Amino acid sequence: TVLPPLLTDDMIAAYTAALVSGTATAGWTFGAGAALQIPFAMQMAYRFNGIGVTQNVLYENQKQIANQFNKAISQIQESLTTTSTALGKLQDVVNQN
Amino acid sequence: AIPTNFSISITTEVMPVSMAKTSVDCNMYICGDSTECANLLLQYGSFC
Amino acid sequence: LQTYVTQQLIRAAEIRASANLAATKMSECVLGQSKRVDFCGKGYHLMSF
Amino acid sequence: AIPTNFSISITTEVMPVSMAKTSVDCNMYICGDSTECANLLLQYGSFCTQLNRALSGIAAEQDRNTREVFAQVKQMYKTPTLKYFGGFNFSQILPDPLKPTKRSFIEDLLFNKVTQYGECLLICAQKFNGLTVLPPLLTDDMIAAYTAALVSGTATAGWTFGAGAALQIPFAMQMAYRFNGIGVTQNVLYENQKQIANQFNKAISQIQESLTTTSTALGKLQDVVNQNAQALNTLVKQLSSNFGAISSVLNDILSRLDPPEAEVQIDRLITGRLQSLQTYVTQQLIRAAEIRASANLAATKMSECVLGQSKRVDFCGKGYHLMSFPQAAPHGVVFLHVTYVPSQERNFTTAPAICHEGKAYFPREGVFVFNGTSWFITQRNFFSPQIITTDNTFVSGNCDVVIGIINNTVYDPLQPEL
Amino acid sequence: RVVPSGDVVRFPNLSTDLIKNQCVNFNFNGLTGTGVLTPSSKRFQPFQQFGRDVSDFTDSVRDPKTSEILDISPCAFGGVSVITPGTNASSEVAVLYQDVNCTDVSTAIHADQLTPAWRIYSTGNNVFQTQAGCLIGAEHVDTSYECDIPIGAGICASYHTVKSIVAYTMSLGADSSIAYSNNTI
Numbered sequence: 001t002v003l004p005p006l007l008t009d010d011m012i013a014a015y016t017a018a019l020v021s022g023t024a025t026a027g028w029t030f031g032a033g034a035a036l037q038i039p040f041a042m043q044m045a046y047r048f049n050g051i052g053v054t055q056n057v058l059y060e061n062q063k064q065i066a067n068q069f070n071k072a073i074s075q076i077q078e079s080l081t082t083t084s085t086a087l088g089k090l091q092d093v094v095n096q097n
Numbered sequence: 098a099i100p101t102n103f104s105i106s107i108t109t110e111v112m113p114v115s116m117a118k119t120s121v122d123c124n125m126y127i128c129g130d131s132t133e134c135a136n137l138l139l140q141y142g143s144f145c
Numbered sequence: 146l147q148t149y150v151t152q153q154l155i156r157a158a159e160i161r162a163s164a165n166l167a168a169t170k171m172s173e174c175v176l177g178q179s180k181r182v183d184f185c186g187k188g189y190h191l192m193s194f
Numbered sequence: 195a196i197p198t199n200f201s202i203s204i205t206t207e208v209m210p211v212s213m214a215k216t217s218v219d220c221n222m223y224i225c226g227d228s229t230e231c232a233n234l235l236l237q238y239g240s241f242c243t244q245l246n247r248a249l250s251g252i253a254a255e256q257d258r259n260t261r262e263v264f265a266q267v268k269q270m271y272k273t274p275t276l277k278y279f280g281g282f283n284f285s286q287i288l289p290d291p292l293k294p295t296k297r298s299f300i301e302d303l304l305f306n307k308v309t310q311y312g313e314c315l316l317i318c319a320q321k322f323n324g325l326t327v328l329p330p331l332l333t334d335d336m337i338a339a340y341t342a343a344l345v346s347g348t349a350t351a352g353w354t355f356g357a358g359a360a361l362q363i364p365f366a367m368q369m370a371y372r373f374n375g376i377g378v379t380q381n382v383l384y385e386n387q388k389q390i391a392n393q394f395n396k397a398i399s400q401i402q403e404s405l406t407t408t409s410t411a412l413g414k415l416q417d418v419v420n421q422n423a424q425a426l427n428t429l430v431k432q433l434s435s436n437f438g439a440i441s442s443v444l445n446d447i448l449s450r451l452d453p454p455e456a457e458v459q460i461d462r463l464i465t466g467r468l469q470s471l472q473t474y475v476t477q478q479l480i481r482a483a484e485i486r487a488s489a490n491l492a493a494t495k496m497s498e499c500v501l502g503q504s505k506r507v508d509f510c511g512k513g514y515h516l517m518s519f520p521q522a523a524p525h526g527v528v529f530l531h532v533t534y535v536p537s538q539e540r541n542f543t544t545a546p547a548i549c550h551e552g553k554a555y556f557p558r559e560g561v562f563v564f565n566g567t568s569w570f571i572t573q574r575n576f577f578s579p580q581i582i583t584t585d586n587t588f589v590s591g592n593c594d595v596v597i598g599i600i601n602n603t604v605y606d607p608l609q610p611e612l
Numbered sequence: 613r614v615v616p617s618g619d620v621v622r623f624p625n626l627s628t629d630l631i632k633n634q635c636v637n638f639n640f641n642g643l644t645g646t647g648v649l650t651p652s653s654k655r656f657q658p659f660q661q662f663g664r665d666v667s668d669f670t671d672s673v674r675d676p677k678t679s680e681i682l683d684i685s686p687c688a689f690g691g692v693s694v695i696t697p698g699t700n701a702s703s704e705v706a707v708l709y710q711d712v713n714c715t716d717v718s719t720a721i722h723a724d725q726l727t728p729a730w731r732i733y734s735t736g737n738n739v740f741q742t743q744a745g746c747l748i749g750a751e752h753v754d755t756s757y758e759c760d761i762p763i764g765a766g767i768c769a770s771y772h773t774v775k776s777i778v779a780y781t782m783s784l785g786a787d788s789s790i791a792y793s794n795n796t797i
């Protein structure tokens with residue numbers, strides 16, 4: 001027989017939706033300690049001088065970046081829409097046991 | 098060489114986490130409604 | 146049945162090493178900007194989900 | 195939201211490093227003073243050869259694990275006399291030369307909260323079933339010697355203490371770099387020195403009184419002894435398995451019935467135990483692979499957290515890592531993650547951009563908030579409002595491009611020369 | 613292992629005498645086996661006759677003949693490891709007798725009840741007792757070095773010039789010392 005797991009997928013989604021929602025607010029003390037609040041662009045700007053880019057490149061090209069952001073997501077969305085070809089690993093573990 | 102423009106990729110990664118846990122009964126596997134199956138496995142400790 | 150259990154047991158411990166990598170990739174890759182190369186995907190990492 | 199104040203915590207971590215090594219004789223397990231057992235054993239190959247060397251091979255790799263954790267330094271640094279450096283009281287962490295047991299007071303808790311088979315104790319003794327525990331190579335005071343040596347040399351150099359031959363530095367100055375590592379100006383250490391030393395030395399005793407009375411934080415160690423004793427007890431339990439033969443007594447079958455009858459009966463019995471011994475070997479073998487994989491994580495944490503500040507969050511415990519400390523224990527180690535945790539958040543209104551005379555002024559680092567009166571600059575780790583000049587803010591491009599620009603000015607020191 | 617030399621057979625009122633501290637092939641009343649005999653101190657009852665381990669092994673006995681408490685022990689056994697500095701270096705070896713009393717091994721070797729034995733072998737008067745067992749064929753110096761050939765309990769074996777095979781306690785490393793101050797760097 002198969003025992004059911006301890007958690008449901010919805011409870012896993014409850015952690016998943018919270019952290020993604022909590023990603024857009026604090027970032028680093030978000031997990032290191034108590035949460036904080038920052039605008040998303042300022043949080044984005046820390047990534048640039050994090051890798052060594054001045055904050056103007058974000059702040060100037062903000063429309064191009066955001067359009068590169070959302071449009072590539074839909075390209076990722078249609079990438080995992082037509083045919084699978086990627087999640088064979090989770091198919092493998094079901095095939096093994 | 099110094100780059101001028103850029104591109105924002107979205108790289109994915111898929112990781113397995115949880116193997117499906119199982120369980121099994123002995124007498125519904127080795128015995129199958131028998132008595133002398135259960136009556137004679139007493140020389141084998143408690144394997145189940 | 147006996148060789149089933151041991152052969153079930155090895156792949157049990159096999160994915161537990163893989164879950165540790167996921168536990169590393171949940172915290173270190175998402176909750177902060179990583180700096181190590183080709184971890185968190187290719188290219189210079191900004192943000193994970 | 196910006197935190198204003200902080201706390202300093204000492205988070206604990208316990209990782210096992212080594213499994214108790216075993217060995218099993220064949221004839222004192224399967225034969226039991228029976229000559230005909232050995233006479234029948236010769237038709238089963240020299241299985242005892244690989245049955246010895248498999249368990250001996252994993253016995254050798256146990257001692258491979260321990261020196262992969264500890265045997266890293268080259269100079270046994272001496273225990274310093276003073277145990278109180280800049281308000282920080284290490285005296286219960288180093289071992290006491292006044293009462294020589296070569297253990298800390300913290301370690302003496304650990305050799306108590308954790309508190310058949312052949313074993314030697316100095317008198318050796320062995321049981322009937324031909325199985326015993328070999329003692330480990332590195333004895334505990336020797337391990338405690340490496341334990342005391344590294345923590346002592348930790349409070350003196352750190353980096354060259356991890357880069358080979360160590361150096362000498364004042365301990366408060368080495369603290370201030372770690373604040374500078376996470377983006378805190380070093381005065382903040384210097385201007386809060388007694389409060390930090392209070393928060394340090396209280397938090398040890400708060401931890402010290404925590405683990406003293408209750409337990410089960412150490413549960414990751416005692417299970418290891420609890421699981422393999424059950425594995426040993428498993429093999430010992432199997433002796434009463436008759437395997438379809440007459441009984442689990444060889445001497446009755448030697449005495450009651452004929453040898454042509456017995457040498458299919460004890461043959462059925464010998465193949466019972468021999469197959470049973472293989473199952474113990476394999477589970478013992480695969481478990482040794484897991485703890486060794488866990489040991490490689492432990493050896494990685496020894497060099498990436500103790501011998502140097504790390505930066506990966508939620509590694510070395512939660513919070514911003516400051517400094518690590520090892521503690522010896524049976525079959526494992528205990529780490530002490532002295533970490534930084536901020537506090538006292540407030541609300542402030544941002545300023546991404548500053549419009550002064552049609553130009554775009556962006557900070558070299560930090561951000562800009564309105565405290566209520568004017569605009570100031572501070573770092574993200576700590577609320578330190580400062581003055582807005584060209585010393586911390588470059589110019590690039592004109593005004594009126596970006597979103598959220600503020601009409602304010604910039605101080606320049608060129609002005610009072612007139 | 614050690615050859616069982618001796619036989620004790622007793623019955624209450626054929627009978628033999630009481631051998632102690634020797635691996636004998638005892639036979640009490642419905643109790644057989646080999647082992648080493650020695651007196652016990654276990655608190656019996658008037659109906660107790662023989663004790664057991666928590667395992668399936670009888671460990672103590674009450675005399676059928678004279679009603680005296682004796683505890684039985686297994687005879688002697690264990691493994692053998694061979695120490696060598698290399699055939700290129702020299703040609704002499706030493707052995708470890710694993711987890712066994714060096715008081716008894718020295719006894720059994722002079723009476724020659726050890727299996728297996730060899731043609732050309734002697735003691736060499738270097739019997740040291742480690743925690744890991746009995747070492748024969750190496751001299752105990754009191755110096756310290758790095759661990760070439762580990763045996764156990766911090767004791768390691770090596771081959772220095774004195775040339776012979778020596779056993780000692782490990783050198784943990786050089787005992788350096790460095791000052792502390794609040795100005796010095």
Ligand SMILES: *[C@@H]1O[C@H](CO)[C@@H](O[C@@H]2O[C@H](CO)[C@@H](O[C@@H]3O[C@H](CO)[C@@H](O)[C@H](O[C@H]4O[C@H](CO)[C@@H](O)[C@H](O)[C@@H]4O)[C@@H]3O)[C@H](O)[C@H]2NC(C)=O)[C@H](O)[C@H]1NC(C)=O
Nearest residue numbers: 061062063064065066067068069070071101102103104105
């Ligand atoms: C670095 O690369 C980026 C790529 O994202 C680039 O940003 C692009 O700049 C060009 C400048 O011409 C933009 O192109 C135009 O943008 C307008 C805005 O609405 C569009 O409407 C235009 O569409 C016309 O042309 C299309 C292609 O022929 C037609 O399909 C369409 O029907 C219209 O006729 C035109 O595309 C472009 O939009 C941006 N990219 C994004 C994502 O906004 C950037 O300039 C590069 N950097 C440098 C220094 O060159």
Ligand SMILES: *[C@@H]1O[C@H](CO)[C@@H](O[C@@H]2O[C@H](CO)[C@@H](O[C@@H]3O[C@H](CO)[C@@H](O)[C@H](O[C@H]4O[C@H](CO)[C@@H](O)[C@H](O)[C@@H]4O)[C@@H]3O)[C@H](O)[C@H]2NC(C)=O)[C@H](O)[C@H]1NC(C)=O
Nearest residue numbers: 277278279281282283284285286287290299395398399402
């Ligand atoms: C650094 O920290 C250490 C602690 O880690 C600290 O040393 C402690 O000092 C106190 C006293 O100065 C010690 O307390 C005494 O210890 C002895 C033996 O351990 C006990 O017998 C004493 O009990 C008597 O006093 C009690 C209190 O009145 C009575 O209730 C009792 O009935 C007894 O009469 C007393 O507990 C303590 O043991 C040490 N700890 C250690 C680990 O040595 C040190 O002072 C600190 N130094 C600095 C510079 O910060």
Ligand SMILES: *[C@@H]1O[C@H](CO)[C@@H](O[C@@H]2O[C@H](CO)[C@@H](O[C@@H]3O[C@H](CO[C@H]4O[C@H](CO)[C@@H](O)[C@H](O)[C@@H]4O)[C@@H](O)[C@H](O)[C@@H]3O)[C@H](O)[C@H]2NC(C)=O)[C@H](O)[C@H]1NC(C)=O
Nearest residue numbers: 540541542563564565566567568569570577578579580581
């Ligand atoms: C936002 O930042 C503002 C920065 O100016 C804050 O205003 C300052 O608040 C501090 C409070 O610590 C005041 O500092 C004190 O001032 C007194 C009096 O100074 C006056 O007197 C001296 C001597 O006669 C004179 O020389 C000066 O010119 C002053 O006129 C000092 O004696 C104290 O030592 C102490 O420094 C500042 O005065 C005050 N500045 C202004 C311009 O008001 C403000 O509080 C911040 N707001 C928030 C919500 O954080």
Ligand SMILES: *[C@@H]1O[C@H](CO)[C@@H](O[C@@H]2O[C@H](CO)[C@@H](O[C@@H]3O[C@H](CO)[C@@H](O)[C@H](O)[C@@H]3O)[C@H](O)[C@H]2NC(C)=O)[C@H](O)[C@H]1NC(C)=O
Nearest residue numbers: 314315316317318319633711712713714715716741742743
């Ligand atoms: C090997 O077996 C022998 C027994 O034949 C053990 O020798 C015994 O060793 C103990 C101490 O280790 C001796 O006990 C001492 O006795 C004196 C007086 O008898 C007493 O004053 C002391 O306080 C202590 O109790 C004992 O006498 C001695 N017996 C003999 C016959 O030598 C030896 O320890 C065993 N070694 C191992 C490694 O097992």
Ligand SMILES: *[C@@H]1O[C@H](CO)[C@@H](O[C@@H]2O[C@H](CO)[C@@H](O[C@@H]3O[C@H](CO)[C@@H](O)[C@H](O)[C@@H]3O)[C@H](O)[C@H]2NC(C)=O)[C@H](O)[C@H]1NC(C)=O
Nearest residue numbers: 198199200201202386388389390391392393394396537538
């Ligand atoms: C940052 O946070 C620390 C931690 O809370 C603050 O230090 C603590 O401040 C409180 C009061 O604000 C002090 O409590 C007082 O203690 C004295 C002596 O016991 C007592 O007489 C008073 O009645 C009161 O209980 C506490 O001692 C102090 N702790 C230390 C280690 O100094 C600190 O004030 C905060 N600083 C800022 C700038 O926010």
Ligand SMILES: *[C@@H]1O[C@H](CO)[C@@H](O[C@@H]2O[C@H](CO)[C@@H](O[C@@H]3O[C@H](CO)[C@@H](O)[C@H](O)[C@@H]3O)[C@H](O)[C@H]2NC(C)=O)[C@H](O)[C@H]1NC(C)=O
Nearest residue numbers: 548549550551552553592593594595598599600601602603
């Ligand atoms: C922050 O300060 C800047 C400059 O001090 C302000 O921008 C100014 O906005 C006024 C709109 O009232 C512009 O005035 C216009 O000028 C043209 C020039 O011929 C005139 O024809 C129009 O009738 C109108 O008066 C002015 O050019 C502009 N200056 C700059 C340098 O951009 C800005 O409004 C201030 N921010 C806020 C929130 O008020």
Ligand SMILES: *[C@@H]1O[C@H](CO)[C@@H](O[C@@H]2O[C@H](CO)[C@@H](O[C@@H]3O[C@H](CO)[C@@H](O)[C@H](O)[C@@H]3O)[C@H](O)[C@H]2NC(C)=O)[C@H](O)[C@H]1NC(C)=O
Nearest residue numbers: 622623624625627628629630674675676677678679680681
């Ligand atoms: C089974 O029978 C034997 C005799 O066949 C008993 O052995 C006898 O044991 C007693 C007490 O242990 C011995 O008595 C002693 O004798 C000496 C000298 O005669 C005397 O001075 C003492 O005061 C003491 O009474 C007796 O000699 C001994 N006989 C032999 C032949 O050894 C044995 O006790 C019987 N079993 C049981 C459980 O009673």
Ligand SMILES: *[C@@H]1O[C@H](CO)[C@@H](O[C@@H]2O[C@H](CO)[C@@H](O)[C@H](O)[C@H]2NC(C)=O)[C@H](O)[C@H]1NC(C)=O
Nearest residue numbers: 272361362787788789790791792793795796797
């Ligand atoms: C730097 O100073 C330290 C101490 O201030 C020196 O350490 C001592 O060196 C002398 C020999 O130079 C030794 O005899 C002492 O035992 C050392 N002190 C301790 C506590 O061990 C160090 O040698 C100096 N180094 C240089 C290059 O000047």
Ligand SMILES: *[C@@H]1O[C@H](CO)[C@@H](O)[C@H](O)[C@H]1NC(C)=O
Nearest residue numbers: 037195196538539540541542
């Ligand atoms: C900050 O503002 C939020 C609402 O925007 C409020 O709920 C919170 O209590 C405030 N906290 C501080 C420290 O001002």
Ligand SMILES: *[C@@H]1O[C@H](CO)[C@@H](O)[C@H](O)[C@H]1NC(C)=O
Nearest residue numbers: 697698699700701702703775
């Ligand atoms: C033995 O060691 C010597 C040096 O002591 C070396 O020259 C020689 O090549 C070695 N020979 C073998 C067979 O190992």
